[PDB]
Amino acid sequence: GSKKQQTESAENKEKICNAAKDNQKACENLKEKGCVFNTESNKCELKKDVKEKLEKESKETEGKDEKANTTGS
């Protein structure tokens, strides 16, 4: 199956953040896009916080059939 360790969503997100490199103000502007300045590494990094919290928001209802939705009868 398809695992989500980054994929497209996190790639472009991270890339937008990394496009600011280590400019804090630029990252502050990109904050709306999921970019958070990380002082630890000293760069604009993807907010994995929001990335995950948004991902678990993307469960639609709950019935995501990955192998089977329901056997029913």
Swiss-Prot record:
It is found in: Cell membrane. It comes from the Eukaryota. Glycans are attached at residue 69. A lipid is attached at residue 73 (GPI-anchor amidated serine). VSG forms a coat on the surface of the parasite. The trypanosome evades the immune response of the host by expressing a series of antigenically distinct VSGs from an estimated 1000 VSG genes. This is Variant surface glycoprotein MITAT 1.1. It comes from Trypanosoma brucei brucei. The chain holds residues 404 to 475 of 492 of the full protein.
